[PDB]
Amino acid sequence: ENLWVTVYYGVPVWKDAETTLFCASDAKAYETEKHNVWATHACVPTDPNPQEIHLENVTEEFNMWKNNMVEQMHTDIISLWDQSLKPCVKLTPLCVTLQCTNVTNNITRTELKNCSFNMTTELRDKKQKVYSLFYRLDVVQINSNKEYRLINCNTSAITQACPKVSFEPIPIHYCAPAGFAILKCKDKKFNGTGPCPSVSTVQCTHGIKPVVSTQLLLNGSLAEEEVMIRSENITNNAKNILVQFNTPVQINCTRPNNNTRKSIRIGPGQAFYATGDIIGDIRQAHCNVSKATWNETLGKVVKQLRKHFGNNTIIRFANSSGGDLEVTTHSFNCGGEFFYCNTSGLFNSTWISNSNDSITLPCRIKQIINMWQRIGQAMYAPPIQGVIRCVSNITGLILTRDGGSTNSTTETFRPGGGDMRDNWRSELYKYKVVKIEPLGVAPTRCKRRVVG
Amino acid sequence: EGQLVQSGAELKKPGASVKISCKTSGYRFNFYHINWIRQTAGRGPEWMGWISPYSGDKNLAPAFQDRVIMTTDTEVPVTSFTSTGAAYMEIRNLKFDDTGTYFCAKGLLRDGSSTWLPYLWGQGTLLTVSSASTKGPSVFPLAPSSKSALGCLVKDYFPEPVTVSWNSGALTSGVHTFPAVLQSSGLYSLSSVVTVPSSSLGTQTYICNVNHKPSNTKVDKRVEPK
Amino acid sequence: LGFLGAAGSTMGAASMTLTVQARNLLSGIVQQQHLLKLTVWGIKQLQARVLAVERYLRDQQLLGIWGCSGKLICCTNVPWNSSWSNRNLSEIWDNMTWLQWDKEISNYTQIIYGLLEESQNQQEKNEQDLLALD
Amino acid sequence: LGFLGAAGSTMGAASMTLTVQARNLLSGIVQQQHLLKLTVWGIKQLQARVLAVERYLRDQQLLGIWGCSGKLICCTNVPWNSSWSNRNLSEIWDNMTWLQWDKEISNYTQIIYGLLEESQNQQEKNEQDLLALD
Ligand SMILES: *[C@@H]1O[C@H](CO[C@@H]2O[C@@H](C)[C@@H](O)[C@@H](O)[C@@H]2O)[C@@H](O[C@@H]2O[C@H](CO)[C@@H](O[C@@H]3O[C@H](CO[C@H]4O[C@H](CO)[C@@H](O)[C@H](O)[C@@H]4O[C@@H]4O[C@H](CO)[C@@H](O[C@@H]5O[C@H](CO)[C@H](O)[C@H](O)[C@H]5O)[C@H](O)[C@H]4NC(C)=O)[C@@H](O)[C@H](O[C@H]4O[C@H](CO)[C@@H](O)[C@H](O)[C@@H]4O)[C@@H]3O)[C@H](O)[C@H]2NC(C)=O)[C@H](O)[C@H]1NC(C)=O
Ligand SMILES: *[C@@H]1O[C@H](CO[C@@H]2O[C@@H](C)[C@@H](O)[C@@H](O)[C@@H]2O)[C@@H](O[C@@H]2O[C@H](CO)[C@@H](O[C@@H]3O[C@H](CO[C@H]4O[C@H](CO[C@H]5O[C@H](CO)[C@@H](O)[C@H](O)[C@@H]5O)[C@@H](O)[C@H](O)[C@@H]4O)[C@@H](O)[C@H](O[C@H]4O[C@H](CO)[C@@H](O)[C@H](O)[C@@H]4O[C@@H]4O[C@H](CO)[C@@H](O)[C@H](O)[C@H]4NC(C)=O)[C@@H]3O)[C@H](O)[C@H]2NC(C)=O)[C@H](O)[C@H]1NC(C)=O
Ligand SMILES: *[C@@H]1O[C@H](CO)[C@@H](O[C@@H]2O[C@H](CO)[C@@H](O[C@@H]3O[C@H](CO[C@H]4O[C@H](CO[C@H]5O[C@H](CO)[C@@H](O)[C@H](O)[C@@H]5O)[C@@H](O)[C@H](O)[C@@H]4O)[C@@H](O)[C@H](O[C@H]4O[C@H](CO)[C@@H](O)[C@H](O[C@H]5O[C@H](CO)[C@@H](O)[C@H](O)[C@@H]5O)[C@@H]4O)[C@@H]3O)[C@H](O)[C@H]2NC(C)=O)[C@H](O)[C@H]1NC(C)=O
Ligand SMILES: *[C@@H]1O[C@H](CO)[C@@H](O[C@@H]2O[C@H](CO)[C@@H](O[C@@H]3O[C@H](CO[C@H]4O[C@H](CO[C@H]5O[C@H](CO)[C@@H](O)[C@H](O)[C@@H]5O)[C@@H](O)[C@H](O[C@H]5O[C@H](CO)[C@@H](O)[C@H](O)[C@@H]5O)[C@@H]4O)[C@@H](O)[C@H](O[C@H]4O[C@H](CO)[C@@H](O)[C@H](O)[C@@H]4O)[C@@H]3O)[C@H](O)[C@H]2NC(C)=O)[C@H](O)[C@H]1NC(C)=O
Ligand SMILES: *[C@@H]1O[C@H](CO)[C@@H](O[C@@H]2O[C@H](CO)[C@@H](O[C@@H]3O[C@H](CO[C@H]4O[C@H](CO[C@H]5O[C@H](CO)[C@@H](O)[C@H](O)[C@@H]5O)[C@@H](O)[C@H](O)[C@@H]4O)[C@@H](O)[C@H](O[C@H]4O[C@H](CO)[C@@H](O)[C@H](O)[C@@H]4O)[C@@H]3O)[C@H](O)[C@H]2NC(C)=O)[C@H](O)[C@H]1NC(C)=O
Ligand SMILES: *[C@@H]1O[C@H](CO)[C@@H](O[C@@H]2O[C@H](CO)[C@@H](O[C@@H]3O[C@H](CO)[C@@H](O)[C@H](O)[C@@H]3O)[C@H](O)[C@H]2NC(C)=O)[C@H](O)[C@H]1NC(C)=O
Ligand SMILES: *[C@@H]1O[C@H](CO)[C@@H](O[C@@H]2O[C@H](CO)[C@@H](O[C@@H]3O[C@H](CO)[C@@H](O)[C@H](O)[C@@H]3O)[C@H](O)[C@H]2NC(C)=O)[C@H](O)[C@H]1NC(C)=O
Ligand SMILES: *[C@@H]1O[C@H](CO)[C@@H](O[C@@H]2O[C@H](CO)[C@@H](O[C@@H]3O[C@H](CO)[C@@H](O)[C@H](O)[C@@H]3O)[C@H](O)[C@H]2NC(C)=O)[C@H](O)[C@H]1NC(C)=O
Ligand SMILES: *[C@@H]1O[C@H](CO)[C@@H](O[C@@H]2O[C@H](CO)[C@@H](O)[C@H](O)[C@H]2NC(C)=O)[C@H](O)[C@H]1NC(C)=O
Ligand SMILES: *[C@@H]1O[C@H](CO)[C@@H](O)[C@H](O)[C@H]1NC(C)=O
Ligand SMILES: *[C@@H]1O[C@H](CO)[C@@H](O)[C@H](O)[C@H]1NC(C)=O
Ligand SMILES: *[C@@H]1O[C@H](CO)[C@@H](O)[C@H](O)[C@H]1NC(C)=O
């Protein structure tokens, strides 16, 4: 006996918890381009020196499908999207009886309409007719001379996005507040979520960019080894599966249409930017994929799924069965306009048990959108005048169920990205924040002065 | 607080070279050191060499650094504080002087004053470096005399321990047992107690099995009525 | 050792450099750094800076009523109760990380705090009644 | 005695447990705990948490320049002026609540504060010039 208790301020202990974070991005575009939708007009700049410390002898258990960093990311981008659209031109007097006719094809695919209507002019007393153009599926028939209707006027409002807003995703660091720390896993093969042995305590995450993609993730991060397979629950086929590419496949998307900005003043100052007549031929949008480079990626995936999924059953790769055309096609915002390249061409290959040609995909463009199934308010995308090219790295895949097969064999995973939060999980699978507790009591024979 | 268990029951010729293994569980395998010891036919057990699962810096005994060398792979973490690993060791030369029982044990503590000494011990492995060939034991019933304390008999088996002798594992509480015996011929034998209340023969079972490795087992002989 | 360097090391080695851990936490995060400033990031910055000081000052208020206003390590005149831990002197300090110890007293950690205020300050600062001037 | 238990009791009995009163005030209020967070309650929560620390730190800044960084009761080397109160030793401590005493010095309470910084710290920390190393 005769042991006393002693206090220690500065002890390294923590408990699993989550709180608010903040943005961090250095000097990116500022003057040459500004008014970004993600970095806002000003965010807390990150320091070039990276805050990193390697932790030894520690094996903290992470979690990815129960991590709340993706939850705050999901909800931050949503409130950020609306904050950058509230001060922009509303498009309410654009819901008037549209009388359209098919475009000039030498009296003979269609996909677009040379439509018109009459709107408000600078004077509310006077009205003005202007002929613009619209895309298919942005409009659906009402009930000779075709008379059409904006599809959104049936369900929700509409507000045009601002023309000087940059929709390019830039790296947005999520750094921890004071008294907290973001633990990153350094173990390469982090199957599922368990006890990651190689941990690093970093203050600022890496360059995370908010790629708004569907079925196929682009510009993601990865750190070697077999193409990693992550699933909240491997036995349940109903759950979604995130897949990471040991090497990215360089893809290029573009639209050949040469459009023109037609500004028409609605009301006092606001102007509605629509499509004029398309100059220099009309062509369909497409995304190329390296055919030889894709056959190796589908082979590496099926190899590591094999020891994961019995390694005895048959591979059945099909198009995204069911769903909606925006949730089953590779939907993504690129170059201002919103592409929806046809996925069904990639997963036609089936491989089981033991200058150069490139596969391409037909794509269409949509101007009316309200992503992540937000039915509150929709937005019109002004057609970007001139040329468009995307040319991004693809690094991830989103695959979903394969029916309720009762035992037997034969199954895979067809593409579905029904949830937008999973897209951010491909970057935050290794991060978890903890509540640092600097207080720690321990006994030791040790006492201060007797009387004082 | 972490249980360590050895492989056990491996034996070969004098001029051979065998490796023993040790399953770990319930303690972080990274920093607790592993060491080995051996008790001979001589009275005194002696210490071998201590290995560190991290860094690999080791200081084995000087008399065995030339012949015996041991390594150890990494670990698989169960949680943040429990993990399971394995430690092996290879010995090149050995004789009848190297026969006896071998233990492994967990390193004492992970600090400075003293670490190298053992802490938690395993069940142990016994190694026979006797050149005579392996043989299959023989089974006999061993019936009580005054039936008008129970068990079964083993006669003539060459090496090591035959271990568990009971059928279906039906009784583990109150089952006294007995050790082995050296014969004039050199062929070992043993017997086994079992303390169960006296009852009738038709009501209960009187079957016992023994496991073996010199040769595999199959029959679980029972007792004669009289 | 730049920060949490001994998170996995022994409680003794972690006790050798616990200054570092204390320095970075209050200061850390580089908080210091269209015309509006009502954005979603600024409001997440301000409240993240409020708990920064309101979790620091939640802890610094405890050391002040323990005689440890400006000391990282006070030895306190409170006797240790055997029920809290049965392990000997070198049994815990040479074997457990601070992580393991935080869960081993987290049950009766509040019982310690209440007793620390009584003997080290509630009585000690009173014991000078007969000794201050006499 | 769980909080303000001796608000109506004697200044002596209140001086026996003044730790309790100090503990709860900084910590107290359980501040720690559609998609927006711009509501009228959150803004009343944040500013209520700002004066929480900015009234605590307004007081803790005074004890620091009085040698009382981590003591609830300092005896200060400032002589008491008879003009502030004419009552004897046992006349106030066995008769008045702290409430009554707060209004009896509230007139010349600032005069005391200015003098406390001079003799207990402005001169004391200087008196070591000839005694620190010599
Ligand atoms: C967590 O991770 C850490 C790794 O972190 C490392 O951090 C730094 C330091 C870098 O190395 C990084 O690369 C790493 O990431 C792992 O940490 C390791 O844990 C090991 C197991 O605990 C430990 O292994 C062995 O420790 C033995 C015991 O140490 C000596 O000395 C210390 C300090 O003095 C003392 O506390 C010990 O009890 C013990 O006894 C003392 O020995 C000295 C020397 O003889 C005596 O000094 C004498 O004093 C008299 C006067 O009094 C006179 O001057 C004499 O001349 C003088 O010799 C002293 O009296 C003894 N008593 C005391 C004070 O107690 C070591 O013996 C052994 O050494 C071997 O390795 C060394 C390092 O390479 C070699 O130099 C040496 O030759 C040997 O090969 C081991 O070090 C590791 O040291 C330790 N860290 C390192 C360096 O890796 C950790 O395992 C892991 N898990 C945990 C526990 O959390
Ligand atoms: C997508 O849809 C848009 C919208 O088109 C909409 O429908 C058409 C029918 C039209 O009414 C549009 O106003 C409406 O918004 C298309 O954009 C339009 O495409 C049409 C295609 O025909 C273009 O029409 C031609 O316009 C020529 C010039 O007229 C302009 O100016 C007029 C007033 O100017 C007067 O003076 C100038 C000289 O300074 C003269 O050149 C002009 O004729 C007038 O005298 C104004 O009223 C017009 O709206 C327009 O701004 C016009 O010369 C053409 O008409 C000729 O020739 C045609 C063949 O090229 C022939 O088919 C016509 O029948 C016509 O022949 C006769 O010409 C006489 C000249 O005096 C005339 O008096 C006769 O009446 C006429 N015969 C009869 C009867 O019809 C065309 O009318 C139009 O300019 C485009 N928009 C504009 C700028 O207004 C767009 O092309 C579509 N997509 C694509 C890519 O196809
Ligand atoms: C995943 O990652 C990939 C990474 O590749 C992302 O993909 C793409 O990555 C590209 C990397 O280069 C990004 O390319 C940039 O494109 C912009 C486009 O801006 C043009 O148009 C703006 C507005 O239009 C005005 O001007 C045009 C004429 O161009 C006119 O027709 C219109 O009417 C209107 O007036 C202009 O403000 C802008 O200036 C430009 O014209 C481009 O600005 C970037 O410029 C760099 O590269 C170009 C071409 O090589 C070069 O000329 C630039 O040089 C300097 O000078 C120019 C001219 O004064 C100046 O604008 C620059 O600021 C420089 O000072 C400069 O080096 C660049 O080409 C692309 O945006 C990005 N996104 C797309 C579309 O995919 C991918 O986005 C990521 N993930 C996903 C799928 O989102
Ligand atoms: C994204 O892009 C993908 C691209 O695939 C697209 O998928 C399309 O989905 C639609 C609707 O689900 C498909 O639509 C129809 O498919 C019809 C099926 O073929 C019948 O007729 C066959 C003869 O067709 C020849 O070509 C087919 C390929 O389509 C080929 O298999 C045949 O061998 C043959 O060469 C007939 O053979 C076939 O069934 C017999 O043969 C098969 C194969 O040997 C055998 O297994 C069966 O047992 C049976 O014996 C079947 O009866 C197709 O007929 C139809 O229209 C065709 O003719 C019209 C008129 O000329 C053409 O205009 C048209 O281009 C077709 O040639 C129509 O195509 C469609 O096939 C899928 N793929 C495409 C485009 O071909 C997704 O929907 C896209 N996503 C979005 C967002 O839309
Ligand atoms: C990822 O998540 C999935 C979620 O599904 C986890 O998947 C587990 O898969 C296994 C596959 O076998 C399931 O096992 C069975 O689930 C049954 C579901 O119960 C349903 O029916 C109940 C009763 O309804 C009627 O039909 C049943 C049919 O058996 C009759 O027995 C009954 O009399 C009725 O006529 C409903 O009450 C219930 O709501 C469901 O609709 C279970 O019923 C079934 O129980 C059997 O096995 C039990 C465990 O041994 C045993 O106690 C029971 O007595 C019975 O024998 C059995 O559990 C899992 O249920 C399923 N998990 C979940 C959450 O349901 C998957 O494990 C996870 N990831 C992992 C770890 O891989
Ligand atoms: C806004 O556009 C609409 C059409 O979407 C205008 O409504 C009427 O549309 C018809 C379409 O043919 C116009 O045609 C005209 O019909 C008359 C009589 O049948 C005929 O003599 C003309 O030669 C021509 O074919 C018509 O002008 C137009 N208005 C009327 C009175 O019917 C609408 O007027 C436009 N602006 C608004 C809202 O006032
Ligand atoms: C990552 O790999 C680890 C193994 O290193 C997996 O842990 C083990 O996973 C299997 C299958 O999911 C578990 O077996 C099953 O457990 C469930 C209950 O969760 C039970 O219902 C089934 O009958 C079966 O027993 C196993 O318990 C689990 N743990 C261990 C220690 O083996 C892990 O699932 C993989 N996925 C991750 C976390 O990414
Ligand atoms: C997309 O369409 C625009 C507009 O048509 C194209 O811009 C045009 O490019 C040509 C290239 O030679 C320019 O050169 C010449 O202009 C003279 C005078 O106007 C004209 O007589 C020639 O026939 C030729 O067009 C032209 O000025 C320029 N702009 C216009 C008003 O046509 C553009 O080239 C197309 N796509 C891209 C980006 O290449
Ligand atoms: C697919 O399965 C075969 C056998 O089912 C794998 O070959 C090895 O088979 C033995 C005995 O069944 C297992 O113990 C091995 O674990 C199997 N190999 C491995 C490394 O898993 C074959 O490897 C499996 N597919 C692949 C290519 O991994
Ligand atoms: C125009 O396209 C629509 C698409 O449904 C079609 O119904 C209509 O008949 C087409 N009209 C002409 C004449 O091309
Ligand atoms: C994308 O464009 C680049 C331009 O150099 C080209 O090299 C690459 O092959 C293209 N990839 C595909 C398949 O679209
Ligand atoms: C070690 O612990 C025992 C109780 O398990 C205790 O009685 C003993 O006093 C402790 N050792 C020391 C150093 O006092």
Side-chain angles (χ1 to χ4, degrees), chain A residues 97-99 116-118 127 129 145:
Chain A
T97 45
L98 305 162
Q99 283 189 27
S116 182
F117 62 98
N118 7 19
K127 314 298 178 182
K129 300 183 186 182
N145 191 19

Short mmCIF file of all heavy atoms in Angstrom, two decimals, chain A residues 97-99 116-118 127 129 145, ligand 6:
data_model
loop_
_atom_site.label_atom_id
_atom_site.label_comp_id
_atom_site.label_asym_id
_atom_site.label_seq_id
_atom_site.Cartn_x
_atom_site.Cartn_y
_atom_site.Cartn_z
N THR A 97 -47.52 27.29 -72.72
CA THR A 97 -47.81 26.31 -73.77
C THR A 97 -46.78 26.40 -74.89
O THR A 97 -46.77 27.37 -75.66
CB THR A 97 -49.22 26.52 -74.32
OG1 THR A 97 -49.45 27.91 -74.54
CG2 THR A 97 -50.26 25.98 -73.34
N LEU A 98 -45.91 25.40 -74.97
CA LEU A 98 -44.86 25.35 -75.98
C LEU A 98 -45.41 24.70 -77.25
O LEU A 98 -45.99 23.62 -77.18
CB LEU A 98 -43.67 24.54 -75.47
CG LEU A 98 -42.96 24.89 -74.16
CD1 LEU A 98 -42.13 23.71 -73.70
CD2 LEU A 98 -42.08 26.09 -74.36
N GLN A 99 -45.21 25.35 -78.39
CA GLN A 99 -45.54 24.78 -79.69
C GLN A 99 -44.23 24.51 -80.42
O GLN A 99 -43.53 25.45 -80.83
CB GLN A 99 -46.45 25.70 -80.50
CG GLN A 99 -47.90 25.67 -80.04
CD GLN A 99 -48.83 26.42 -80.98
OE1 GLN A 99 -48.56 26.54 -82.18
NE2 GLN A 99 -49.93 26.92 -80.44
N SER A 116 -40.78 26.72 -79.47
CA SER A 116 -40.99 28.12 -79.17
C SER A 116 -42.05 28.25 -78.08
O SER A 116 -42.58 27.26 -77.56
CB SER A 116 -41.44 28.91 -80.39
OG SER A 116 -41.58 30.29 -80.06
N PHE A 117 -42.36 29.50 -77.77
CA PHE A 117 -43.24 29.92 -76.69
C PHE A 117 -43.19 31.44 -76.65
O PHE A 117 -42.45 32.05 -77.43
CB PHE A 117 -42.81 29.33 -75.35
CG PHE A 117 -41.44 29.76 -74.90
CD1 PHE A 117 -41.29 30.79 -73.99
CD2 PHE A 117 -40.31 29.14 -75.40
CE1 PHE A 117 -40.03 31.19 -73.58
CE2 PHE A 117 -39.05 29.53 -74.99
CZ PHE A 117 -38.91 30.56 -74.09
N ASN A 118 -43.95 32.05 -75.76
CA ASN A 118 -43.85 33.49 -75.57
C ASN A 118 -43.68 33.68 -74.07
O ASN A 118 -44.32 33.00 -73.28
CB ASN A 118 -45.02 34.29 -76.12
CG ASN A 118 -46.15 33.43 -76.62
OD1 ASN A 118 -46.27 32.25 -76.27
ND2 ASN A 118 -47.00 34.02 -77.45
N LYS A 127 -45.51 41.29 -74.33
CA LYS A 127 -45.05 39.91 -74.41
C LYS A 127 -44.20 39.74 -75.67
O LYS A 127 -44.31 40.52 -76.62
CB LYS A 127 -46.22 38.92 -74.43
CG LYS A 127 -47.30 39.21 -73.39
CD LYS A 127 -46.77 39.10 -71.97
CE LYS A 127 -47.84 39.44 -70.95
NZ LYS A 127 -47.32 39.40 -69.55
N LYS A 129 -42.39 36.63 -78.37
CA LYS A 129 -42.14 35.26 -78.81
C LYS A 129 -40.68 35.09 -79.19
O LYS A 129 -40.09 35.94 -79.86
CB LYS A 129 -43.01 34.90 -80.01
CG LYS A 129 -44.51 34.98 -79.80
CD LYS A 129 -45.23 34.53 -81.06
CE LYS A 129 -46.73 34.72 -80.96
NZ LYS A 129 -47.45 34.24 -82.17
N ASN A 145 -50.22 19.90 -85.11
CA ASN A 145 -49.04 20.70 -84.77
C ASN A 145 -48.69 20.41 -83.32
O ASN A 145 -49.48 20.72 -82.42
CB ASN A 145 -49.30 22.19 -85.00
CG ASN A 145 -48.03 23.02 -84.91
OD1 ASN A 145 -46.92 22.49 -85.02
ND2 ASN A 145 -48.19 24.32 -84.71
C1 LIG E 6 -48.10 33.10 -78.02
O1 LIG E 6 -48.09 32.01 -78.94
C2 LIG E 6 -49.40 31.45 -79.09
C3 LIG E 6 -49.30 30.15 -79.87
O2 LIG E 6 -48.64 29.16 -79.07
C4 LIG E 6 -50.38 32.49 -79.68
O3 LIG E 6 -51.73 31.98 -79.79
C5 LIG E 6 -52.22 31.87 -81.15
O4 LIG E 6 -51.44 30.90 -81.85
C6 LIG E 6 -51.91 30.69 -83.18
C7 LIG E 6 -51.19 29.49 -83.80
O5 LIG E 6 -51.59 29.36 -85.17
C8 LIG E 6 -51.70 31.96 -84.00
O6 LIG E 6 -52.15 31.61 -85.33
C9 LIG E 6 -52.98 32.55 -86.03
O7 LIG E 6 -54.36 32.18 -86.07
C10 LIG E 6 -55.15 33.20 -86.69
C11 LIG E 6 -56.64 32.90 -86.50
O8 LIG E 6 -56.86 31.49 -86.48
C12 LIG E 6 -54.77 33.28 -88.16
O9 LIG E 6 -55.56 34.27 -88.83
C13 LIG E 6 -53.29 33.63 -88.28
O10 LIG E 6 -52.88 33.58 -89.65
C14 LIG E 6 -52.46 32.63 -87.47
O11 LIG E 6 -52.54 31.34 -88.06
C15 LIG E 6 -52.43 33.15 -83.36
O12 LIG E 6 -51.92 34.37 -83.90
C16 LIG E 6 -52.15 33.22 -81.87
N1 LIG E 6 -53.15 34.11 -81.29
C17 LIG E 6 -54.48 34.00 -81.48
C18 LIG E 6 -55.26 35.26 -81.27
O13 LIG E 6 -55.05 32.96 -81.79
C19 LIG E 6 -50.41 33.70 -78.74
O14 LIG E 6 -51.22 34.75 -79.29
C20 LIG E 6 -49.00 34.21 -78.52
N2 LIG E 6 -48.93 35.32 -77.58
C21 LIG E 6 -49.83 35.59 -76.65
C22 LIG E 6 -49.79 34.76 -75.40
O15 LIG E 6 -50.64 36.48 -76.78
#
